[PDB]
Design a binder for this molecule. Structure first.
Ligand SMILES: CN1CCC([C@@](C)(O)c2ccc3cnc(Nc4cc(N5CCOCC5)c(C#N)cc4F)cc3n2)CC1
Ligand SMILES: [Cl-]
Ligand SMILES: [Cl-]
Ligand SMILES: [Cl-]
Ligand SMILES: [Cl-]
Ligand SMILES: [Cl-]
Ligand SMILES: [Cl-]
Ligand SMILES: [Cl-]
Ligand SMILES: [Cl-]
Ligand SMILES: [Cl-]
Ligand SMILES: [Cl-]
Ligand SMILES: [Cl-]
Ligand SMILES: [Cl-]
Ligand SMILES: [Cl-]
Ligand SMILES: [Cl-]
Ligand SMILES: [Cl-]
Ligand SMILES: [Cl-]
Ligand SMILES: [Cl-]
Ligand SMILES: [Cl-]
Ligand SMILES: [Cl-]
Lengths: 290, 148
């Protein structure tokens, strides 16, 4: 109508994504189409939240919402166009990244995430599909359909947030409340994919299997490490796995500095997880690193 | 700090704001809001009710900057209050996605989606700020109590 569709990018359950051209100014953008008369309703709610948050999250490492159009019983979000996502990029580069790229991608992810948290927003859906990459080597976090503003006192958030593979142990144990630390775990999981074959660090079949794969590698937290754990709503006894299990084979592209950052993101006790701001000041992002 | 008392305040606020509405009761808003919240619970879109003190305060913030004094009918007021509510569900709701049948009271569906995009363009900054800035929440919380 005002834009010219070129090729479909993706076919989500929350909408259809096209690569398009502005007929007026001839610029290439991404288009998300959202139908507005669904007998199985609800889809628009996610779109409105995503809009309300992205209007107040302007940053070079967060996908830009340019405009929103309403026409012919359809809602159309207009994002900047990005060459691909990280999921397709792994399949494209054989899952193998140069160590200096792993640094670039994580740095940009933390900058974007740092902004989101400072602006009082949780992403709650980090994963490679929601990390957009352009040829020039820029990374931008996207998809704020499950994202949420926080600060008002509430009884609880949702425990049914984040794809099982990037969900932190507190939330897997059904924790009612969580802070910004929810996203810093997901970020740790993503770091481990960049640092190996682009394969999920913790690819469990269900909640139980997920928690077994996290403790098997990092160790089952003690009462000292995480006293709150046994009091959590869906807590149950897990085997004590040793904290002696080495990460060197798991993230073989990272040296000691890299591996240190990864462990501060992957603290099971949410209160102990490093913040985006703290992580950007880590030696791994110093101009003094081998 | 009671939901029904804060709902009452909002209903008394809406009656004060919309002078033109001569046969509007401060119970009509309360009824309309509780009808939606009940309807979504008994249809299984949510486990618990949305309408808590903090959410009613959130709704009030939207209402007071969106609902014009020149609302020309009780029907037009419902259409707007429910557009503000739908956006409160969408922004503060625990469940990911809520339907719009219970919220829709206009034949013209196009007119509703246009109101959503207006209210968002106006309030999106304040919708985030009431969370981000605890002082601003308290200011709005007080103002609501001072509307009875
Ligand atoms: C799961 N979630 C779904 C929603 C989506 C959305 C709407 O929020 C959104 C935002 C902004 C976007 C910017 N850019 C893109 N370009 C892409 C272009 C691709 N092309 C490769 C070359 O050949 C044609 C297809 C491919 C692939 N493959 C992936 C792309 F992400 C897509 C965006 N999507 C976010 C992700
Ligand atoms: Cl798909
Ligand atoms: Cl802004
Ligand atoms: Cl662009
Ligand atoms: Cl650009
Ligand atoms: Cl760059
Ligand atoms: Cl998704
Ligand atoms: Cl809270
Ligand atoms: Cl906890
Ligand atoms: Cl641990
Ligand atoms: Cl800490
Ligand atoms: Cl309280
Ligand atoms: Cl009541
Ligand atoms: Cl009274
Ligand atoms: Cl009248
Ligand atoms: Cl009721
Ligand atoms: Cl449900
Ligand atoms: Cl006015
Ligand atoms: Cl109705
Ligand atoms: Cl229509």
């Amino acid at each position: 109508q005002k834009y010219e569709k070129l090729e479909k990018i993706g076919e989500g359950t929350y909408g259809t994504v096209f690569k398009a051209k502005n007929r007026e100014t001839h610029e290439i953008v991404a288009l998300k189409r959202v139908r507005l008369d669904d007998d199985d309703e609800g889809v628009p709610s996610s779109a409105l939240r995503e809009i309300c948050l992205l209007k107040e999250l302007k940053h070079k490492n967060i996908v830009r919402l340019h405009d929103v159009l309403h026409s012919d019983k359809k809602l159309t979000l207009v994002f900047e166009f990005c060459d691909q996502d990280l999921k397709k990029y792994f399949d494209s580069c054989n899952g193998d990244l140069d160590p200096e790229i792993v640094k670039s991608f994580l740095f940009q992810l933390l900058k974007g995430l740092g902004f989101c948290h400072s602006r009082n927003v949780l992403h709650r859906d980090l994963k490679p599909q929601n990390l957009l990459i352009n040829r020039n080597g820029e990374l931008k976090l996207a998809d704020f359909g499950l994202a949420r503003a926080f600060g008002i006192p509430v009884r609880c958030y949702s425990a049914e947030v984040v794809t099982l593979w990037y969900r932190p142990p507190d939330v897997l144990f059904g924790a009612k409340l969580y802070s910004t630390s929810i996203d810093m775990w997901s970020a740790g999981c993503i770091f481990a994919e960049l640092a190996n074959a682009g394969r999920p660090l913790f690819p469990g079949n269900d909640v139980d299997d997920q928690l077994k794969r996290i403790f098997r590698l990092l160790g089952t937290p003690t009462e000292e490490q995480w006293p709150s754990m046994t009091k959590l709503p869906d807590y149950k006894p897990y085997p004590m796995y040793p904290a002696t299990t080495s990460l060197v084979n798991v993230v073989p592209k990272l040296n000691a500095t890299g591996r240190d950052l990864l462990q501060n993101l992957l603290k099971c006790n949410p209160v102990q997880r490093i913040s985006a701001e703290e992580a950007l000041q880590h030696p791994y992002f110093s101009d003094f690193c081998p | 700090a009671s939901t029904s008392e804060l709902l009452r305040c909002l209903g008394e606020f809406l009656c004060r704001r919309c002078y033109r509405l001569k046969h509007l009761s401060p119970t009509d808003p309360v009824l309309w809001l509780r009808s939606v919240d009940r309807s979504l619970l008994l249809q299984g879109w949510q486990d618990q009710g949305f309408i808590t003190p903090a959410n009613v305060v959130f709704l009030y913030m939207l209402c007071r900057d969106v609902i014009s004094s020149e609302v020309g009918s009780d029907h037009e007021l419902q259409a707007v209050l429910l557009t503000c509510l739908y956006l409160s569900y969408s922004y503060m709701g625990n469940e990911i996605s809520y339907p719009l049948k219970p919220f829709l009271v206009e034949s013209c569906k196009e007119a509703f989606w246009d109101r959503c995009l207006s209210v968002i363009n106006l309030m999106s900054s304040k919708m985030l700020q009431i969370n981000a800035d605890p002082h601003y929440f308290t200011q709005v919380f007080s103002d609501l109590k001072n509307e009875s």
